[PDB]
Curated annotation (Swiss-Prot):
Organism encoding this protein: Mycolicibacterium smegmatis (strain ATCC 700084 / mc(2)155) (Mycobacterium smegmatis)
Subunit structure: The RNAP catalytic core consists of 2 alpha, 1 beta, 1 beta' and 1 omega subunit. When a sigma factor is associated with the core the holoenzyme is formed, which can initiate transcription.
CDD domains: RNAP_beta'_C (cd02655), RNAP_beta'_N (cd01609)
Single Gene Ontology BP annotation: DNA-templated transcription
UniProt name for this protein: DNA-directed RNA polymerase subunit beta'
Transcription keyword on record: yes
Taxonomy of the source species: Bacteria, Bacillati, Actinomycetota, Actinomycetes, Mycobacteriales
Amino acid sequence: DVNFFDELRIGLATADDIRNWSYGEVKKPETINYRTLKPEKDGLFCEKIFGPTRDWECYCGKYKRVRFKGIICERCGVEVTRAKVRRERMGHIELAAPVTHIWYFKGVPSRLGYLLDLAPKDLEKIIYFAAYVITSVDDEMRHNELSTLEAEMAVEKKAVEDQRDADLEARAQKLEADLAELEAEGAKSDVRRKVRDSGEREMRQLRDRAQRELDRLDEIWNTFTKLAPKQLIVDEVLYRELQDRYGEYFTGAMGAESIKKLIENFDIDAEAESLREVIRSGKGQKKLRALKRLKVVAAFQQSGNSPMGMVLDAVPVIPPELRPMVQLDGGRFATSDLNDLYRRVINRNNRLKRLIDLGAPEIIVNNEKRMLQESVDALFDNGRRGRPVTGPGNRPLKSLSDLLKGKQGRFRQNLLGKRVDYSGRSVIVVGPQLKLHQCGLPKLMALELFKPFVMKRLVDLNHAQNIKSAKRMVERQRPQVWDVLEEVIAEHPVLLNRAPTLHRLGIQAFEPQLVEGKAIQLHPLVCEAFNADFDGDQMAVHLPLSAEAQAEARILMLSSNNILSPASGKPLAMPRLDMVTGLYYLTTLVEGATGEYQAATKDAPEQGVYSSPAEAIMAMDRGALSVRAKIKVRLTELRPPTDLEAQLFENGWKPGDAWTAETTLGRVMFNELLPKSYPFVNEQMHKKVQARIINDLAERFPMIVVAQTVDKLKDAGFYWATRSGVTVSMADVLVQKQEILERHEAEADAIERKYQRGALNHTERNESLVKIWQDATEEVGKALEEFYPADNPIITIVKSGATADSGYLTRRLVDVSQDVIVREHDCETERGINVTLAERGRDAHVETSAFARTLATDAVDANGNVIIERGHDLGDPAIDALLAAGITTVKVRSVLTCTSATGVCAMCYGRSMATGKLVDIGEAVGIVAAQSIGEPGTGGLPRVQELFEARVPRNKAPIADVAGRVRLEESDKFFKITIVPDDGGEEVVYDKLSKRQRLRVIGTEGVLSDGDHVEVGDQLMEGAADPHEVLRVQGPREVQIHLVKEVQEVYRAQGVSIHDKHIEVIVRQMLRRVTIIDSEFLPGSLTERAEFEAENAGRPVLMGITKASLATDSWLSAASFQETTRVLTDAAINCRSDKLNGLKENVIIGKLIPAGTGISRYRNIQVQPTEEARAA
Ligand SMILES: [Mg+2]
Ligand SMILES: [Zn+2]
Ligand SMILES: [Zn+2]
């Protein structure tokens, strides 16, 4: 129980290993006495083997106190110890006949089948007693006696031939005697023809019954001559005949004991050398069969494991506490299915012993051995072969495999995790008065949650004498504890989560505030991160306990520290839906307002000027000023626009200096919410304009400033939403359109008096309908804005901008990329990827592809002057600065080109989308990238899975194999594209292409035509290109650019914003594997590039995420991913040892994940105060 182990390794469990584990053999299929309800001796639940029912007490009772421990009872045989051992101790069942492990027989592929070269349909007929198998043959005696046996065989065969000829003539002779009478007696052509045709029918049987015996006798001799080990005999009458005579020359058996015999005399190395040959042409499946099966043959040779482990002579028994039988509520009994499945085995194993001792015939005995074989099969994996064992109501019993996979109805692959203590949930309500770092917590929920904490401080003071008394003081809600509750709650963070959890911002930390009521008060800004609508939703609360857990909540998971979405980089706490409309109304400008500014005339001076922003407030309170007016005032504590600041001062900022501008009072009050250092804006706040502002605020200021700024925008946005005057009624909604559409409809009706005959034209018809429909839509669009002033509530809201299957893909995305973490600051690789970056005469995809990147090379202008230098954050100010220089393309580091041996590096990955700074070392990007792609799952999802699984496109598209010109040939059968190479070599033609698979689109633009030039990477037709095709054409690095290109294009069609680096992390894991061609080492197992490249013929290989995730280093992580059965068998044979490298393994065993705070450099930190501060 050291909690730290290096390796976890498996292997086939021999019958001796099973006998070593067991504390005894369970001999009876008994569970518990029906009267005493106590464990029956020598059966299941027997205390003499598994363990005592009660702590430190034996069965008979002669040893009860703890004084006797580590001893056994002489009368009952129960070791006196804790009752927990019932859960840790196993039994075993000694089998009267060997039995095969169903995992190595019915597996796909069949391990025994590939080991002994037995077809799965032939192997099933042996262990289930459907055929005989030759175990051994004596060569010397057969060769020495072959002479005499051939003589006796031909003599017996001749004696039958002599009998056939003798019996036929005698009977055929008698047929002539009957016809002699029929000539003299009744003579007709049809009276004798029947018996004549009958006589021929009678004779035809005589020939065939004698002939069929010659074949039967020929079959015995030819089988004896070519008889050899491993041969099969399904006749069983030939076999008995084969054993009646020549019975001493050979031997044979059935069932698992015969399979056990072949392994006994079997040479792995001698069977390996035969499989080592790649000659014997084997251009097709003949050699690959020997190569594919060699994986199971060479696996036994390398290690010391004996293949005998596949046939069990003993079966282990799972401890009783894991297969319990306990009395239910209301007196009913309950028990696991394993007890009945174990009972099935021990019942037949015992009856087999009775049959053997009875000298029963082999039919009964071999039938019982087959039934014994099927019980162990059902015990391990029920229903894998034949119909499963069904209990009451015809429900399949749950075997051990169902237990291990976690199959309840169909599958629950640990996605339920496990329930935790110190948790709770309730319904959530709006918390508009809360700070971003706060959350409203019901007093009762916080009381029960912190119950151990308040009990301590309550005992520290004299309110309760001892801890037992304080428990009743908290449980009965004595009013003395509420003052104590606020102390233990203060500065003690809690975690909030709303299911489903899509991205990491679905779990955040807050500062708990004691709140009246039973609901949870949630901050209105985190709703978008939680996707929490306020209609009957609930959220769960978890209380961190350890100092490390509290630190991770206050630093990593704090609500105010997580603002930017860690997918695109945009802020998620930006105001929305009311604070947008509230701020839109405050900053909007209306001419002719009550306090409108008026220029000075000869009679009176300017009336719109105010001494300070404070006066305008006093004017706003009176009926003199409207907040939306155009007044111009003087501002001191507010800084001016940067365009006008240089003209006005140019001598520095103005903390106390004054200046004058023409704005609205609302725009003044709005800019006071922003930081003092931020310049003036003076615009009506759109939804895009506010997002534009929050973005620039996040970069130039620490997030605390951005957190409190958005918090100030919430108060004003909510405050002015009420004063906004937004209300709905009949007028603002009710549909004009009646008379409009009643008129347009008659035009389409009269078109039938034309389409019938005279004026159809067959294309003016469709064109007339489309034009008239769009014309009505154009008139409807005008009527939509013709009936409402721009201040209409619905219109105002629109203007401001206020208004399940995916989980499958996400889990595979997480399964393949969960191990991808940043492990080093810089790998110092010199080669990245080119970014398009601003077509001009401005690419909208630069924010996803070019933004938050790091330059691999310097950005050089044609004039010679260098601008943003390599290794730079490539911020948005740098893009605009680069755009001014007029440069098209830039080269940028990427994780696709990262040369890091382990994971990726910080420099190649770049800026963290959430932090806005360089990504930290501990960061685990693979999971963040998987969630970033999975959440939008809610031309679509089925296409996205096609790409990540690297399957063949639904409609294949041609790619140019070489560069040159193109010859377009159009035929009815299919299009024809022939590429004339610039080299002058053999032409490349692309034939039989469906005509509906339209041609690809191209200073002069257009669509591809005859004679165009095409480079190596151009796609010839519209559609999807085979990712395996481009792999061998352009190379592995161009594949990753192509994959991300198509994946990004799908999510862009729906309006989703995901940075390319997230997709690039998933695509990085596909090409990591290379296929070793052949032999130095051996065949094309999908290996690792670095492991192969860093040590000394192979290929680059593209493969799906599901196939890639199963190829990872650890086996018990791949076992939890897909089809635990196949993974475990291979991992058992090769004795694969799991080094616990990945984080999934540590989660399974409860270790600290090797990511974030679990990294060795971070968790080994030593903390000691400076001697300068110690002495003070
Ligand atoms: Mg809801
Ligand atoms: Zn006893
Ligand atoms: Zn790198």
